[PDB]
Design an enzyme around this catalytic site. Structure first.
Site, PDB file in Angstrom:
ATOM      1  N   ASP A  38      18.382  77.220  32.838  1.00  0.00           N
ATOM      2  CA  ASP A  38      19.188  76.747  31.728  1.00  0.00           C
ATOM      3  C   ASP A  38      18.713  75.407  31.155  1.00  0.00           C
ATOM      4  OD1 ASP A  38      21.034  75.671  30.049  1.00  0.00           O
ATOM      5  OD2 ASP A  38      22.795  76.174  31.253  1.00  0.00           O
ATOM      6  N   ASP A 225      18.200  76.247  23.824  1.00  0.00           N
ATOM      7  CA  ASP A 225      19.058  76.452  24.982  1.00  0.00           C
ATOM      8  C   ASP A 225      18.913  77.846  25.578  1.00  0.00           C
ATOM      9  OD1 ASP A 225      21.134  76.514  26.846  1.00  0.00           O
ATOM     10  OD2 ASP A 225      22.688  76.822  25.315  1.00  0.00           O
TER      11      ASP A 225
END
Ligand SMILES: CN(C)c1cccc(CNC[C@@H](O)[C@H](Cc2ccccc2)NC(=O)[C@]2(Cc3ccccc3)CN(Cc3ccccc3)C(=O)N2)c1
Length: 379
Positions: A38, A225
């Site tokens: 992430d 992201d």
């Protein structure tokens, strides 16, 4: 300079719409755990107690190398959240650089809407900057440790390959693998070192200008992201985009629910009208003044496929009120180099990305574009 990281290729796995994760080990003796990649977080965290969606977890009372910071923490994500207790320990990466560092770790004790039923990953590895890592910028992010403790160059790269089941991909730590991409790698500045904030300066559906003040593209912020699946766009830009795209697909019309992600569309076995959906280009402020480049994706990127004899898809372009979010629909088309040493990010065509016989993702440049730094949002 090593340009073939044999050990780290295909080191990533994923179950569509549920993210890409890597295998890691913690505690001594080592305890295996499937951590989730992430680039939009900064806390390294793991399932540290039994929970129905977790197949297994980290038990601090079995690691001799354990150690407890005697402090609690929790982090609110877009929808879910977790509450854990901080500590330290030895972390490794079986298919990554052969090093063994000491990182920070939130042992997750209580969680709501965080772990996904049978997602096969037990924790998250926020790879972003310390600026937004809870409790605060003091809790040194994992990649920062891996860097100061060993010799792995300050930079990592990511190749996410979707599908048309079980998504794969590569996470090359400390280097760039020449075999993961084709053509030229273009870099774009990293505006500020908190999130991986970049800047879009022109958008266009099927080569046709969306035509807005490039400030609406970065209203609030724009970020890469990997921890997000959809291509998220500001309020104003989202509508504009769906109208345009809608226009280009007019051969066939779809329920308002589709374009809102509420419904999913299907077609007879492998008879998808791929060629009716337009290509999408994002122009990112280049490194050289007044110079910028563009990355273009395909329907095969933004129409994420969904599990009879049909092929159903979910529209993966949605609205957002927190800036633009270049998630997976974007990334799954490129080889993204998160070059932290030089405050930048490269984009090259992904050699594993899905594309049909007639169109392919791409990265082209340069384009003499003026007044780009003004496309950025100040507050
Ligand atoms: C802490 N911090 C600074 C911060 C606070 C708020 C927002 C952000 C922006 N980063 C978001 C990602 O870091 C974060 C990673 C994550 C993945 C799974 C479970 C929980 C979190 N993604 C989401 O919250 C979701 C939020 C979301 C949930 C449901 C529908 C739309 C978006 C998860 N979802 C799908 C997904 C599931 C599993 C794995 C990968 C992706 C997304 O695409 N994004 C950062």
């Amino acid at each position: 300079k090593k340009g073939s990281f044999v050990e780290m290729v295909d080191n990533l796995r994923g179950k569509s719409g549920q993210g890409y994760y890597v295998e890691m080990t913690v505690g001594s003796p080592p305890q295996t755990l499937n951590i989730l990649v992430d680039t939009g977080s900064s806390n390294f965290a793991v399932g540290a107690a039994p929970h129905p969606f977790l197949h297994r977890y980290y038990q601090r009372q079995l690691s001799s190398t354990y150690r407890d910071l005697r402090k609690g923490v929790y982090v609110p994500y877009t929808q879910g959240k977790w509450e854990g207790e901080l500590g330290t320990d030895l972390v490794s990466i079986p298919h990554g650089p052969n090093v063994t560092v000491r990182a920070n770790i939130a042992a997750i004790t209580e969680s709501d809407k965080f772990f996904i039923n049978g997602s096969n990953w037990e924790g998250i590895l926020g790879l972003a900057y310390a600026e937004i890592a809870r409790p605060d910028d003091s809790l040194e992010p994992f990649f920062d440790s891996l860097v100061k403790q060993t010799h792995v160059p300050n930079l990592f790269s990511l190749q996410l390959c979707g599908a048309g089941a079980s998504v794969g991909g590569s996470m090359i730590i400390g280097g760039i693998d020449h075999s993961l991409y084709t053509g030229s790698l273009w870099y774009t500045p990293i505006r500020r070192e908190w999130y991986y904030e970049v800047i879009i300066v022109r958008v266009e559906i099927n080569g046709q200008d969306l035509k807005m003040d490039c400030k609406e593209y970065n209203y609030d912020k724009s970020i890469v992201d990997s921890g997000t699946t959809n291509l998220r766009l500001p309020k104003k830009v989202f509508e504009a985009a769906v109208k345009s795209i809608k226009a280009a697909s007019s051969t066939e019309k779809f329920p308002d629910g589709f374009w809102l992600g509420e419904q999913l569309v299907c077609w007879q076995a492998g008879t998808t009208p791929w060629n009716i959906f337009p290509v999408i280009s994002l122009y990112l402020m280049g490194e050289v003044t007044n110079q910028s480049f563009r990355i273009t994706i395909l329907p095969q990127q933004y129409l994420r496929p969904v599990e009879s004899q049909d092929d159903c898809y979910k529209f993966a372009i949605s609205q957002s009120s927190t800036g633009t979010v270049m998630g997976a629909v974007i990334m799954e088309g490129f080889y993204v180099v998160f070059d932290r040493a030089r405050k930048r990010i490269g984009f090259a065509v992904s050699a594993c990305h899905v594309h049909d016989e007639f169109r392919t993702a791409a990265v082209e440049g340069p384009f003499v574009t003026l007044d780009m730094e003004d496309c950025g949002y100040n507050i």
